[PDB]
Structures are given as C-alpha cells and as structure tokens.
Amino acid sequence: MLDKIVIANRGEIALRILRACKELGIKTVAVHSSADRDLKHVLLADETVCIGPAPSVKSYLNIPAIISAAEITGAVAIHPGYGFLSENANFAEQVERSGFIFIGPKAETIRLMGDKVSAIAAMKKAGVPCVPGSDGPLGDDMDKNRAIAKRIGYPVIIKASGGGGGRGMRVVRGDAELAQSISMTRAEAKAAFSNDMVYMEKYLENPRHVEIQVLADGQGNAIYLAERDCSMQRRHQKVVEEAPAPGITPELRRYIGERCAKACVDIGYRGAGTFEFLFENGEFYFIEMNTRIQVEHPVTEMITGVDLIKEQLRIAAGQPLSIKQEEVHVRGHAVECRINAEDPNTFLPSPGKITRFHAPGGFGVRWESHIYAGYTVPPYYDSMIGKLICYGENRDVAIARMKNALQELIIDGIKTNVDLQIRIMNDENFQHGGTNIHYLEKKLGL
C-alpha cells in the first residue's frame, strides 16, 4: 500500500479521499490555501502544507507548489480529486517525471480523452456507439462543411475539441447559420483553450445524460459498475444524479457496459473513469470520457457496494481490482442531491459563515461534506458545499428518504439550494422518472 499521499484538492472530495486513506492505513498530506486552514480534512490530516494564498492559480492549480509539498513530506503519490488539475495531462506528466504516482490514468490517456475528436475516434474504433458526426475536425471550406451537415442531417451541433462539459457549443438548424456558428465556436475555443479545433455532431433534441462507471487495474482487468442518470441540470451543471438509470434494463446495461470495459482494454486505461452518453429512443451515443473520479461517484457506491476511492488507491499501488465483473450486482437505488451555497434568485455563489449546522441521519442516509457550525465558505472556490445521498431498496424509497433527510438538514447563515432540491424531489415528472437534460430549466422557466 502507498505509504503517504498528497490530497491535491479541497472541500468535500478532499475529506472523502482522507477517509479512504485512513481506512487503508495511508498517511495523509493536506495541501491547502491560506483561506482553507480550517477545512475539516486539513484539521484531520496527518500533515499539512500551506501551498499559497486563496486564489486557485497560486494554490490548487500551482503545480510547483504541490509537487514541492510532496517532496518535502516524503509523500509517494498525489490524488487530484476532481476539477483543478485532475484532467491536466501536463500535470500528470510532471508528477510522474518527478517520481511520484499520479492517482489516475497515464498522462497520454488523459490527453487522448481531453481531445474530444481523438477520444471519439478511439471509442468508435473500439466499438462504442457514438453520435453521428464529422469523424474529424472541421476545416475552413464551407462547401465541405455544408456537405458534412447535409450528410448528418440538420439539426447539428458544433463543439470544441479542447472543450468539455457541454461548454461553448452551438446548435445549427440550417445552412444560413452554419458559417457563423462554426466561426464563433472556433473563436471562443481559441480564447478559452488556445485550441480552435471544432467538430460537428447530429443534434439530439431531448436526450437523457446516462454515464457508465469503469475501473481498470494494471493487471489488465477492466469492469463496469452500472450507470448513473445525471439529466437534472442547470447550465450544463448537474444538480441531481441517480443510479441505476430509470428504464435501463439489465440487457441494455450489459450491452453498453461490456463495450465500455472493452474500450478500456483497447486503450490501456487505468484507474476510475466515466463514459458519458446521450441516451435517446433506447439508444446510447458516446460524447466524452472523464478520467477522474467524479462528484457523483457515491450513488454508484451505494448500489454496488464498491468503494471507488479505495479502488483508485489499490490500483495505484499495483493491486488488482478487489472485485470481478461477475461479482458486481446492482442492488437498490440511490439519489444524490448537490448542496450549493447559492442565491435562489440569481444562482450566484453565496459565500459566508455558517451559524447553525445539522446533518441528517438514519438508514440509507449518507452526508458527504466538510461543513460545520462556525465554518466560513470562502468566495474563491466552487459553490458546492456538500452532497446528500440516499439509498433505498427501490427508487421510491430512495426519494422518500431524500425528502426526509432534506427536511432535517439545517444550514443557517448562508443561502443554499435545499429548498430547490425539496421542490425537485416533489416534482411529479421526476417522481415518474426519465426526465431529459432540458427538464429542470423548463420547470424553472430559465
């Protein structure tokens, strides 16, 4: 087992990783900004290193500082969590060059998945279903671009190759808007990523977001751990996630899961990963792969019994997966509600000091959060302050328990989205299940 690791993150996920480390007897190094000295995981960590001031550029994105913390403490590995540097291939490369273990895939694999065009080519080659598209980057020949659009059939969508998470895309419904849509997407990608490559896909009108969890070890084993529906979104940001996805049969699960595991073998994948699909009219279409552990991982843990963070750590140590595919069984149902410190009218972050706090408890109730009474939510980081996950023997019980747990949750002193989450749990269409990626914004009239 790894002797000591740097937790290169903050907030709830840093605490999540710390718990897993403690269970495995792994010593912890909590690197933190000057604004995060009183983070719960920092207070629980074996060693702490202040890596810079509050702004993330000088702390959680500061590659030299993080690697230096690993060096000075005698750590052997770095867990990047999610966000920050977790999808930064150059960071992974530098970590390995510096002689530490990066808890994730090989840097080349991170780079492959960060290039959406290259990622799609790889998945298509491996037999994973993808969205009908350009199968390559678009050039500047608008005669050619119109021909590609005609072959796919309007409506289409232009996407940045160096992008992700539904950001910076534009839908095109006819030739008259194609040139400008391509140009603008290109320009925005260049300004954001210094990478102006774009591609084209068929635009699906009302898909659901269904993603497959995988794990692959360095012994050649690769397994899938069912799926999650993450269709409840605002501005492409997930709000509620659940597992399994309503309406997905064991046969469909097996079909798509096997193709994802096969792809992992083909590309030499290692660690946790997520294959994101659009699901419409009973069909899956791959859009992108995330190589990190994700925010919504706990719903998969609840329904499979597999501790995904511990598996990440085992894999990085050179241990084989603790479970085989035939030992993975979907049991029950889990829902996750993200808890955000946000204004209910503007949806802007709402930082400040928590004056009273009380967490829900009970059978099937799992609360993932670093917050506590008297804790100050800083303005410098993401609005998500916790995650409430409820498990039941079926979907209805999971929803019932979430309703009850949301009512017990007290977070005073700052504005949160608890009341919105209560509204979503009471939504008749959510209760029926299978709502699409546009539903929440439609409900809210946004």
Q: Which residues bind Cl ion (CB under 5 A)?
A: 82, 294-295
Annotated binding-site residue? 204: yes
Active site (annotated) includes residue 292: yes
Q: How far is the CB of 140 from Cl ion (least distance, A)?
A: 34
When the beta carbons of 56 and 290 are compared against ligand L22, the nearer one is 290
Annotated binding-site residue? 241: no
* Phi, psi (degrees; rounded to nearest 5) at 283: -120, 140
Annotated binding-site residue? 203: yes
Question: Which of Cl ion, ligand L22, none does residue 82 bind (CB under 5 to 8 Å by kind)?
Answer: Cl ion
Contact 259, 266 (CB under 8 A): no
Q: Can you tell me the distance from the alpha carbon of 149 to that of 178, in angstroms, rounded to the nearest whole number?
A: 9
Q: How far is the CB of 278 from Cl ion (least distance, A)?
A: 18
Q: Can you tell me the distance from the alpha carbon of 69 to that of 234, in angstroms, rounded to the nearest whole number?
A: 37
Q: Can you tell me the distance from the alpha carbon of 134 to that of 15, in angstroms, rounded to the nearest whole number?
A: 42
Q: Can you tell me the distance from the alpha carbon of 269 to that of 210, in angstroms, rounded to the nearest whole number?
A: 20
Quote the tokens at residue 300. 């998969």
When the beta carbons of 201 and 342 are compared against ligand L22, the nearer one is 201
Question: Which of ligand L22, Cl ion, none does residue 203 bind (CB under 5 to 8 Å by kind)?
Answer: ligand L22
When the beta carbons of 11 and 364 are compared against Cl ion, the nearer one is 11
DSSP 80-93: --SSTTTT-HHHHH
Q: How far is the CB of 286 from ligand L22 (least distance, A)?
A: 10
Question: Which of Cl ion, ligand L22, none does residue 385 bind (CB under 5 to 8 Å by kind)?
Answer: none
The DSSP call for residue 243 is E
Quote the tokens at residue 213. 């969890």
Beta strands in 61-127 (DSSP E): 77-79, 101-102
Q: Quick one: how many helices (H) and strands (E) in the chain?
A: 15, 20
Annotated binding-site residue? 413: no
| Residue in 392, 410, 413 with CA at minimum distance from that of residue 401 | 392
Annotated binding-site residue? 327: no
Q: Can you tell me the distance from the alpha carbon of 181 to that of 339, in angstroms, rounded to the nearest whole number?
A: 35
When the beta carbons of 198 and 232 are compared against Cl ion, the nearer one is 232
When the beta carbons of 197 and 272 are compared against Cl ion, the nearer one is 272
Annotated binding-site residue? 236: yes
Residue whose structure tokens are 């290259």 = 118
- Which residue ranges make up the site for ligand L22 (CB under 6 A)? 131, 157, 166, 201-204, 207, 236, 278, 287
Question: Which of Cl ion, ligand L22, none does residue 182 bind (CB under 5 to 8 Å by kind)?
Answer: none
When the beta carbons of 168 and 386 are compared against ligand L22, the nearer one is 168
Q: How far is the CB of 201 from ligand L22 (least distance, A)?
A: 4
Question: Which of ligand L22, Cl ion, none does residue 157 bind (CB under 5 to 8 Å by kind)?
Answer: ligand L22
Q: Up-side HSE of residue 95: CA atoms within 13 Å toward CB?
A: 30
**Alpha-carbon distances of 367 from 243, 250, 413, rounded to whole Å:** 17, 29, 19
Q: Which of 292, 314, 366, 401 is catalytic?
A: 292
Question: Which of Cl ion, ligand L22, none does residue 22 bind (CB under 5 to 8 Å by kind)?
Answer: none
The residue type at 170: R
Annotated binding-site residue? 442: no
| Residue in 353, 343, 387 with CA at minimum distance from that of residue 373 | 353
Q: How far is the CB of 326 from ligand L22 (least distance, A)?
A: 33
Q: Which residues are annotated as a binding site?
A: 116, 159, 165-166, 201-204, 209, 236, 238, 276, 288, 290, 292, 295, 338
Q: Which residues are annotated as a binding site for Mn(2+)?
A: 276, 288, 290
Positions annotated as catalytic residues are 292
Q: Which residues are annotated as a binding site for biotin?
A: 338
Q: Which residues are annotated as a binding site for ATP?
A: 116, 159, 165-166, 201-204, 209, 236, 276, 288
